[PDB]
């Protein structure tokens, strides 16, 4: 029955990290009295922890923003290729945002070029699409949410070559349509472009805030 | 104000993993933007990253087990110093409401018919059991409906005969 106790605390650790927060510590032993033939176990902890503060912000790598708008599908130093069997090109741009404190630069191509036809303001024959899938009940949490589906005058895209093989290095290009056409179709319910319909959503549940729900 | 600093934000659950300790300001704990903080063990673990929307949660169970209902899912703006897309503070949420359909009908019930004749007594000596059954088909139940009560009453009968 010998009562053990703590000895002297050792040297404190220096702050491990060069940015932000870290943790320093001190180590003590139960070496001077020592519990012999039983007793207790020195009463407490052989380890203290402490937070150290370097007060300097940390590297954060930049992240890509979303891609911009596609450029028009025209040719440089020419005119336009609207409503014509001429494949062109168009470009798109990104922006690296958020890079601070010697962080890593954004990895990848900041530009994007793809091949295109042009149906910008092109009068195209059209046909009414079938009923779209029912949308979301809007407004969520607001008074009387309603869904919405719609039929729209879908243009008949012209039967062009979707794959255009260029020479030089024999590069074949997946060509996709660009532009807002002018779809021509017969009226359905007094409307030429889009006729929709709304229906109210049944048995709407109340929105309860998850931090207000846990508490 | 001091705060509990943690070393890792789980993001899959929104929990504060790996406690660095406490008694330290939020600006210093969020210099390392991979860290996270919360006040005590009450909850709401917020990462030290710039504020970004989390993942959309799973859809809530449909408000009724029948016909067209409605179901919710949430998304929480998590981060520190800044705003999410749409003038949203860190901690505010966004909901999506969708019409669900677990099943189609919901049970209307049927009515009983006329009682069947009493069955003979279950034994020929001393005392037994007299059963009386009916059917649930006046009108018949549709989908998941059922008639209220029981379809077979059971009483006792005395045959007045010794074994």
């Amino acid at each position, epitope marked *: 029955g010998v009562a053990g106790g703590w000895g002297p605390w*050792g*040297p404190v*650790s*220096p702050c*491990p*990290v060069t940015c932000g*927060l*870290g*943790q*320093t*510590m001190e*180590q003590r*032993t139960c070496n001077h009295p020592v519990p012999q033939h039983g007793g207790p176990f020195c009463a407490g902890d*052989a*380890t203290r*922890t402490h937070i150290c503060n370097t007060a300097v912000p940390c590297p954060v790598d930049g992240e890509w923003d979303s891609w911009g708008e596609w450029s028009p599908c025209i040719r440089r130093n020419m005119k336009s290729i609207s409503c014509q069997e001429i494949p062109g090109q168009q470009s798109r741009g990104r922006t690296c945002r958020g890079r601070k404190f010697d962080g890593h630069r954004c990895a990848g191509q900041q530009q994007d070029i793809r091949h295109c036809y042009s149906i910008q303001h092109c009068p195209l024959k059209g046909s009414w699409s079938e009923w779209s899938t029912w949308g979301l009940c809007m407004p969520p949490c607001g008074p009387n949410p309603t869904r919405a589906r719609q039929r729209l005058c879908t243009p008949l895209l012209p039967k062009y070559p979707p794959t255009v093989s260029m020479v030089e290095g024999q590069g074949e290009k997946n060509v996709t349509f660009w532009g807002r056409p002018l779809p021509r179709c017969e009226e359905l319910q007094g409307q030429k472009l889009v006729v929709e319909e709304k229906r109210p959503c049944l048995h709407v549940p109340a929105c309860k805030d998850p931090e207000e729900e846990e508490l | 104000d001091p705060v509990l600093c943690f*070393t890792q934000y789980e993001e899959s659950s929104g929990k504060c993993k*790996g*406690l*660095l300790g406490g008694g330290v300001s939020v600006e210093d704990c969020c210099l390392n933007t991979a860290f996270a903080y919360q006040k005590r063990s009450g909850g709401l673990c917020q990462p030290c990253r710039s504020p970004r929307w989390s993942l959309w949660s799973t859809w809530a169970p449909c408000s009724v087990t029948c016909s067209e209902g409605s179901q919710l899912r949430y998304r929480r703006c998590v981060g520190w110093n800044g705003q999410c897309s749409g003038k949203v503070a860190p901690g505010t949420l966004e909901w999506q409401l969708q019409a669900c359909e677990d099943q189609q009908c919901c049970p209307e019930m049927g009515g009983w018919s006329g009682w069947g004749p009493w069955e003979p007594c279950s034994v020929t000596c001393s005392k037994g059991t007299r059963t009386r059954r009916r059917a649930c088909n006046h009108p018949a139940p549709k989908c998941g409906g059922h008639c209220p009560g029981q379809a077979q009453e059971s009483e006792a009968c005395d045959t007045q005969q010794v074994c």
Partner: nanobody
Amino acid sequence: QVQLVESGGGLVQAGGSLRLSCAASERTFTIYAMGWFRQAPGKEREFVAAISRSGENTDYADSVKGRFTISRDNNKNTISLQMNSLKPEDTAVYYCAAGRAILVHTTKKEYDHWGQGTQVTVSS
């Protein structure tokens, strides 16, 4: 930054015991979480044991759990690996490793500082 020196290896019979020690740089010792690795002939390097900066939290590989014990002496800038019931499959070059840990109770499996190694050979 930090240098690591292993010691205590040698030739042991099967079932015997061996105690390795790893000396690290004195001024930066309590900053780094530390551990033991080994690389057998013809095999990749594999995790053996880890210890936090505290010496209070340990982690072990399943192949050595119950036989090996990692300890830390924060008075004398050393860690130790007490290897009991040694088998011929434990023959490897044993490496001491050091890794930066933000918390003092965190055990690591990824390390960016490595010693030159100590040879342990177990004969049957």
